[PDB]
Design a protein around this ligand. Structure first.
Ligand SMILES: [Zn+2]
Ligand SMILES: [Zn+2]
Lengths: 201, 198
């Protein structure tokens, strides 16, 4: 049901090592845990309840940003014999293997050497959208915060420039699926202020 | 010393790529980078202080533990009370959180009997805490302790609290924990209070 993503998914699960003789999981050179979405949901609930939705959104986008940046490093380890899109597409694949979301590239214009990027993707079965509705009910703006942070971090680390993403539709809002658009910071009218969300204090 | 638990619980873990999801029993899971979780921990500790951050993580672990206990209960058939208990250590291990070795475990669910001591090796939490900070002056495997507390309390049907008696986060070569009912802990109801959202 996927292409060319298949190759990516196969070539990636081999970088995924489950070692219950040591109680660890490694993906590439990054240690991972399996975490219940319901536990991340409970954390999110307390964060929004005591910090507010905006600051909580920031914490999650940054957490996602860190994940994406690490996965881009893994992506760059197997660049040999890989087009710019083929390297880009690893993000979508890693996002799927980690059970975060089913990603389908809709159309992608990417040139790393030239600094050109324009990407739109479909997101099916976002864990974050579902978790949010269960904790909060329907939302009045897209809620896949960690997931957007990840696309932003992964793509930016890959390009060596800031690529910001925005959800144009989201299941958290009661759509059938999520859909996103990513492009250079410069090209977003209020980009500099979105950028403020990725900084800690 | 169940290897039998690992192989049998690990079969409950599946990757449904076409739906971009991972299932452990009936619970959806994600693979998350410890580095990212650690970045979150540092922000929470920096902005909300350690005691408040500690509470958030214990309660997150607690929720994980309660839900793995619900999975354990489904596989109740043909298992002793000890066998049931051991699925907790096993799931924690399978989840890549920590490698758990039961040391002495005395359990009888009907009679409300529980006293459990466990060895924790390669704790991700203690590990990440001491890289994002330094050696700490008190045990720091917050989420891991929450999980044990939640798993065992759900299995026993009564409040079972755990404490770390050693922790890699404090420069010990390993973590070690003890779990027993609330009444057996000196300041137990102040420990039970960490599990109540603020
Ligand atoms: Zn969404
Ligand atoms: Zn510890």
């Amino acid at each position: 049901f996927s292409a060319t993503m298949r190759d990516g998914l196969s070539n990636l699960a081999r970088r995924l090592r489950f070692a219950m003789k040591e109680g660890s999981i490694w993906l590439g050179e990054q240690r991972m845990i399996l975490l219940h979405t319901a536990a991340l949901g409970a954390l999110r609930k307390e964060l929004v309840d005591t910090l507010g939705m905006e600051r909580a959104r920031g914490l999650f986008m940054r957490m996602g940003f860190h994940s994406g940046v690490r996965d881009a490093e893994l992506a760059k380890t197997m660049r040999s014999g890989h087009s710019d899109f083929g390297m880009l597409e690893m993000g979508p694949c890693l996002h799927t293997i980690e059970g975060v979301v089913r990603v389908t590239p809709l159309t992608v214009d990417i040139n790393i050497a030239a600094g050109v990027y324009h990407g739109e993707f479909l997101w099916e079965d976002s864990f974050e959208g579902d978790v949010h509705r269960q904790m909060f009910g329907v939302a009045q703006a897209p809620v896949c915060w960690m997931q957007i942070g990840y696309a932003t971090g992964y793509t930016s680390a890959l390009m060596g420039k800031t690529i910001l993403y925005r959800e144009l539709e989201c299941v958290g809002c009661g759509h059938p699926h999520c859909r996103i658009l990513g492009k250079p910071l410069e090209q977003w009218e209020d980009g500099e202020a979105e950028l403020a969300l990725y900084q800690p204090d």
